Amino acid sequence: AKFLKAGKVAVVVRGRYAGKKVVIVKPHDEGSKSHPFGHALVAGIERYPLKVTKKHGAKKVAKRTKIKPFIKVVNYNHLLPTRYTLDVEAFKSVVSTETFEQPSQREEAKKVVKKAFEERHQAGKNQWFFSKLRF
Amino acid sequence: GRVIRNQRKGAGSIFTSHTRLRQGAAKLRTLDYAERHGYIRGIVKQIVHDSGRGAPLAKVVFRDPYKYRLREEIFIANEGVHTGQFIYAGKKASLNVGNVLPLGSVPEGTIVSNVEEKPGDRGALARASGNYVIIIGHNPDENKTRVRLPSGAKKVISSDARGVIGVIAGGGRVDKPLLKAGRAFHKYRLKRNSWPKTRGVAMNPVDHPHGGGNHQHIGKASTISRGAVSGQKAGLIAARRTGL
Amino acid sequence: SINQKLALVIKSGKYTLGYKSTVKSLRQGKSKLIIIAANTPVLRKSELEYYAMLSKTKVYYFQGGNNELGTAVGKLFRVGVVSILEAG
Amino acid sequence: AKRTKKVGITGKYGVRYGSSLRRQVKKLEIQQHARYDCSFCGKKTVKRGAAGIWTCSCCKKTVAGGAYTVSTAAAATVRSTIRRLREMVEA
Amino acid sequence: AQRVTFRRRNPYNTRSNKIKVVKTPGGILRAQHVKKLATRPKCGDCGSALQGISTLRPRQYATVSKTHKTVSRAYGGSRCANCVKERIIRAFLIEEQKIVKKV
Amino acid sequence: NPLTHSTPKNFGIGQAVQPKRNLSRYVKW
Amino acid sequence: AREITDIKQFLELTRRADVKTATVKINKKLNKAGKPFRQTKFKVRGSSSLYTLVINDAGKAKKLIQSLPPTLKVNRL
RNA sequence: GCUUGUGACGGCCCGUGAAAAUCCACAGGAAGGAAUAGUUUUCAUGCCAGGUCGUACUGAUAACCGCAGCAGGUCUCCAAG
RNA sequence: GAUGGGGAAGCUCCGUUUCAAAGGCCUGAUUUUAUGCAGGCCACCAUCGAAAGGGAAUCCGGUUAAGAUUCCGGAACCUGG
Ligand SMILES: [Cl-]
Ligand SMILES: [Mg+2]
Ligand SMILES: [Mg+2]
Ligand SMILES: [Mg+2]
Ligand SMILES: [Mg+2]
Ligand SMILES: [Mg+2]
Ligand SMILES: [Mg+2]
Ligand SMILES: [Mg+2]
Ligand SMILES: [Mg+2]
Ligand SMILES: [Mg+2]
Ligand SMILES: [Zn+2]
Ligand SMILES: [Zn+2]
């Protein structure tokens, strides 16, 4: 009956990431010491990869497949859950409550997320997650 | 005498229409490939007032079939049409209020408005507020449709002529009296210079055929033949009968 | 008679009124049935269906507007969606 | 208290224009100045702008209607006729 | 008791000829010509005023920085947050419905 | 292979914008 | 037209390669409730704007004059 | 309190009460770009230039029009006890 | 109110995007020289019409027999490059 789990894919509705697809890593159903509301820890895409055709060269294909990730704590009311899923075990440990409140630790976590997303995009799977929403 | 009042209106100097505040000519879409084969969907963005016209106007935006852009149309709104409503125009449109269909694609008894006299003239019949056209019969051979007009006349129209389902909004306007000369003044201020009107019998013979005399009277029959010339056609033109 | 059945569950069961509280119940999986008024916007109606599909919750459509649904529950105000937590 | 016996809103015209003409204006002025239920939001917040234009204060949805009423008797008959004809030609 | 005059050759009280009386360091009252007040930019969907956008005359927007004329979000200086929220929800739900209609 | 996808366009009535076709028959000479 | 409060940013203006003159203004002003004091204002004439540094401490005002560059032209009162 | 500016509202219409130049934002992603190096002149500072014609005064019981230094006529802003 | 066109013996009349093959800025191509030559873009198609409508940007002090938001002193702002 509960669908907000550690593999659910959601759509951000507010906060400079509106219209970006995101995946839930760690949910907190009953608030916390900070953020006194239902919220989840998510990792998403800030810059979707561009479309690739057969005419593009090797140097151009690699440039158009770059993905810029982000990490954010989002209220439940600002998320639109979907029916799609994406396993987060490759970067579940690095993204946690401790990775915040530290400028340097946030950068290291996002580098791990970028590696996982780029490998996920290669050998195409989770195609709906890597396709930008049009609105 | 001199040139009478009804002769001076054809020169069009001070008798032209006042068209500063008009929203634009109210026409249907140009009949194209989508209209005659399938249908195209439009969206009502707003319903606005038009100066000099009793009925309100609807702004409908369609997508350009052959180019990436939006095209805006000005329609005469029917009763029940609201902002945000989807409008379907074409041969394969459904029978709903606000949809544009050719007269050959509706059953007998359908109520339509903004009816084309000929296919492609973009609406000529039943445009004033509260008026409509009734479909009374079809002739599948030679592609003709029989319709009933607001004046009661029966007309035969091609079945490819388009029409809008429903009745023109704004009905019942003429049931409230103007109640004073000021309201009539502002009504014709947005239309043209035809008000107030001086009676011909109150003029001099040089001015009007009804003018002159020691009493205010016409002097001859007011029924005027169809063959009379300009300057004579004052009164009741080619009247088949008079009286109550 | 849906009016009679809905009247009884108010007295003996747990219910929820309003859009914001209904979504919260569906998000937490504590809703057994949601009742949606006839005059609600389609965009809002389609969003409640998507939440109910994810949580596997039955959806019933009320034959009346928000004014009528408020009377059926027993309130003097309009109600858009009713969430039934537990039946009586 | 009850300020006037029968003129109602037409008391702004005083003794002019004739009682019969003032009586007909009263019936239609009440209709055009009234509030109506919105079929979209359910609230009684519909008022006339220009003739034939009715807008909801809450929804901000504007509906084309009659000159002095949201829906005329003739327009209601049209909707019934179209609904009956649509069903026959679709099934 | 001190009276003022227009400082331009326009002698008529038009919209572009509005004045305000001020006192100068010289101790006298002198008229000051003020420009017409600006209007806030409006939303492209609902027509409400946009939050976080400077209110200037049209030609003054070419002198201020970009941060004054936008909000860090999609459709920043064009649509308000609520209209952007409705666009995203409507876009997602309709596309999901299209998939189930295909099958 | 896994980066390129097939995205056919629907050129029906009311669908995507029509492509450029040969209009020599309709040219206003 | 522009008031500068940081002492460090004032010294770099005097050697910005576009400054030619500066002036020192001494004002006798009273404090909130007691005896008056000497207020010194340092104004640097830039190419596009005038920068003014205001300090109410007489002791610190003397040190700034000594550290003022000799190339810069200074007008007293 | 007076004059005036402005804000949120309310009444009224079979009257619902200009246009264009011009300026900005967004959607879109064509191109262009880093490692011993480049882009930003929408952040700051610094450099140069900005032509042509009008500009005095009266604006009225004497500077305008009425044969005139004519009790006539002629648009408008500021407004003390 | 021109043009394209159509009227009129003609001085000229109609008409203003009209039954017209109606035009030019983003560059690429070229280091013979200046722009010929390749894609694509856009078809809007003269001009005149407000010293009270729309509109990029300046204020204070001082100065003359007679000028100043224009000169002087000080302090700003806009456009183009
Ligand atoms: Cl006459
Ligand atoms: Mg007489
Ligand atoms: Mg005669
Ligand atoms: Mg006669
Ligand atoms: Mg002006
Ligand atoms: Mg002068
Ligand atoms: Mg004279
Ligand atoms: Mg001509
Ligand atoms: Mg001009
Ligand atoms: Mg002078
Ligand atoms: Zn409503
Ligand atoms: Zn909005």
Q: Is the shortest CB-to-strand distance from E11 to strand H under 7 Å?
A: yes
List of chain B residues whose C-beta atoms are within 8 Å of the C-beta of residue F12:
38
Q: Is the shortest CB-to-strand distance from E39 to strand I under 7 Å?
A: no
Token digits for A42?
A: 């998510």
Cβ of F3 within 8 Å of Cβ of A127? The answer is no
How many other CB atoms are found less than 10 A from the CB of residue C84? 23
| Domain extent listing, chain E | 1-37, 38-103
Structural domain range at position A75: 1-135
Minimum-distance ligand to the CA of B232?
4
Cβ of A19 within 8 Å of Cβ of E81? The answer is no
Longest C-alpha distance within chain G, in Å? 43
- Listed in sequence order, the residues at least 6 apart from G60 whose beta carbon sits closer than 8 Å to its beta carbon are none
Kindly report the backbone phi and psi dihedral angles of residue B65, in degrees, each rounded to the nearest multiple of 5, phi listed first. -65, -35
- Listed in sequence order, the residues at least 6 apart from B192 whose beta carbon sits closer than 8 Å to its beta carbon are B15, B16, B17, B18
Could you tell me the distance, in angstroms and rounded to a whole number, from the CA of residue B204 to the centre of ligand 3?
9
Amino acid identity of residue E86, one-letter, is E
Which 8-state DSSP code applies to residue G13?
A: H
Number of domains in chain A: 1
**Contact status of E90 with chain C (Cβ, < 8 Å):** yes
Query: How would DSSP label each residue in E17-60?
Result: --EEEEE-TTS-EEEEE-PPPP---B-TTT-PBPTT-----GGG
Longest C-alpha distance within chain D, in Å? 61
User: Per DSSP, what are the bridge partners of residue C14?
Assistant: C86
Q: Is the shortest CB-to-strand distance from E12 to strand I under 7 Å?
A: yes
By C-alpha distance, the chain B residue nearest F20 is B66
H-helix or E-strand spanning residue C2: helix C2-12
**Contact status of C86 with chain E (Cβ, < 8 Å):** no
Q: Is the shortest CB-to-strand distance from E14 to strand H under 7 Å?
A: no
Token digits for B27?
A: 């026409």
Distance of C1' in H18 from CA in B191, Å: 17
Chains E and F touch (3+ CB pairs under 8 A): no
Interface test with E, best of C42, C43, C44, C49 (most E CBs within 10 A): C43
Report the distance separating Cα E91 and Cα A21, nearest Å.
13
Query: CB of D52 within 8 A of CB of B56?
Result: yes
User: Per DSSP, what are the bridge partners of residue G23?
Assistant: G43, G75
What resolution in Å is listed for this PDB structure? 2.2
DSSP strands (E only) in chain A: 8-12, 21-28, 39-47, 68-75, 79-85
Nearest to D81 among B111, B170, B175 (CB): B111
- Listed in sequence order, the residues at least 6 apart from B155 whose beta carbon sits closer than 8 Å to its beta carbon are B146, B147, B149
Report the distance separating Cα B56 and Cα D52, nearest Å.
6
Name which of B94, B117, B91 is nearest B31 in CA terms: B91
Q: Which nucleotide shows the minimum CA-to-C1' distance to residue E1?
A: H80
Name which of A79, A1, A75, A82 is nearest A38 in CA terms: A75
By C-alpha distance, the chain F residue nearest A123 is F2
CB-proximal positions of chain H, under 7 Å: 5-7, 11-18, 21-30, 32-33, 42-43, 45-47, 75-80
**Alpha helices (H) along B44-203:** 181-189
Crossing angle for the helix pair C42-55 and E81-102, nearest 10 degrees? 60
Query: CB of E81 within 8 A of CB of A10?
Result: no
How many other CB atoms are found less than 10 A from the CB of residue B108? 12
H-helix or E-strand spanning residue G51: strand G50-55
Cβ of B66 within 8 Å of Cβ of F17? The answer is yes
Report the distance separating Cα E51 and Cα E69, nearest Å.
10
Q: Is the shortest CB-to-strand distance from E8 to strand I under 7 Å?
A: yes
Could you tell me the distance, in angstroms and rounded to a whole number, from the CA of residue E33 to the centre of ligand 10?
21
Could you tell me the distance, in angstroms and rounded to a whole number, from the CA of residue E11 to the centre of ligand 7?
25
Handedness of CA B62, B65, B70, B75 (dihedral sign): negative
**How many beta-carbon pairs under 8 angstroms link A with C?**
20
Name which of C33, C28, E88 is nearest A79 in CA terms: E88
SS3 of residue G55 by DSSP: strand
| Domain extent listing, chain C | 1-88
List of chain D residues whose C-beta atoms are within 8 Å of the C-beta of residue C64:
none
Query: How would DSSP label each residue in A32-50?
Result: -SSS-S-EEEEEEEEEPPP
Which E residues between 38 and 67 have a beta carbon under 7 A from any strand H atom? 58-59, 61-62, 65-66
Cβ of F3 within 8 Å of Cβ of A61? The answer is yes
Cβ of B94 within 8 Å of Cβ of D25? The answer is no
List of chain C residues whose C-beta atoms are within 8 Å of the C-beta of residue D40:
39, 41
CATH topology of domain C1-88: 60s Ribosomal Protein L30; Chain: A; (3.30.1330)
Please state the three-class secondary structure of B157-197 as a single string.
EECCCEEEECCECCCCHHHCCCCCHHHHHHHHHCCCCCCCC
Name which of A95, A87, A92 is nearest A125 in CA terms: A87
| Domain extent listing, chain G | 1-77
